[PDB]
Structure 1
């Protein structure tokens, strides 16, 4: 599904993302916006290294989920990558939280560095009741 902005903001807040490991809701919204346009069903193949990015946060199969076809990959979220293509984002949120328990935190996604870091991200949550 493609979430509407404020519905996603409230969905993420009910899932415990506001301030998780120091990360505001607006930062998670900016991440989802630029990774996927708030789209849970998206996959993007990376031909350079044979990995694939999955779902609303475009989480990569080399370290985070298992798709069976990424050579030498691991599965730190202990999920099939299929779980990251559901309309229900609970599993994707659990995996995003796993990502940010590692040292880089939200910097693990380069799109966040490019499109969210050191920026005014307040617009993403404006009016949403979060």
Structure 2
């Protein structure tokens, strides 16, 4: 499903301010990371990144390619391809707590300035 900025901002409300990252920054990050597509599947190198947050099966979630992957998030990668973002968010938090915002390659180059544009002015 291809969500909208506002739909995303609302959905990930609970991650706001975590690790010092605002919703504006996330809205920016997620657009560039997966274009707000909850079913995005990309093959970064030898691994695959899943969903809206593009969580990789290299270490974070468990897929068929990486059977003995760390699966640090303790979840099947397929659960990151639905429209229930609560488990994608929880996994994002663990990544923020362990690796930090830099896991999201788009953050530094595309979301270091002009963040106000990413604000959802919807009630």
Same fold flag (TM > 0.5): yes
TM-score (normalizing by structure 2)? 0.91
- Verify: 1:5 aligned to 2:5, yes or no: yes
Aligned-residue Cα RMSD (Å) equals: 1.6
What does 1:5-24 align with in structure 2 at a 5 Å threshold?
Answer: 5-13=5-13, 16-24=14-22
What does 1:103-118 align with in structure 2 at a 5 Å threshold?
Answer: 104-116=99-111, 118=112
| Ranges in structure 1 where 5+ consecutive residues have no aligned partner | none
Aligned residues: 123
Report if the CA contact (8 A) 1:45-1:53 is conserved.
Answer: yes
- Verify: 1:96 aligned to 2:92, yes or no: yes
Paired residue for 1:26? 24
Note the alpha carbon deviations across 1:64-116, whole angstroms, 9 max, x for none: 101131376321110000011011111111110110011x4111111222221
TM-score (normalizing by structure 1)? 0.86
Paired residue for 2:40? 42
Cα distance in 1 between the residues matched to 2:117 and 2:47: 32
Cα distance in 1 between the residues matched to 2:94 and 2:50: 15
- Verify: 1:85 aligned to 2:101, yes or no: no
| Ranges in structure 2 where 5+ consecutive residues have no aligned partner | none
Large movers: runs of 4+ above 2 Å: 70-73
Q: CA deviation at 1:126?
A: 3.8
Cα distance in 2 between the residues matched to 1:55 and 1:92: 8
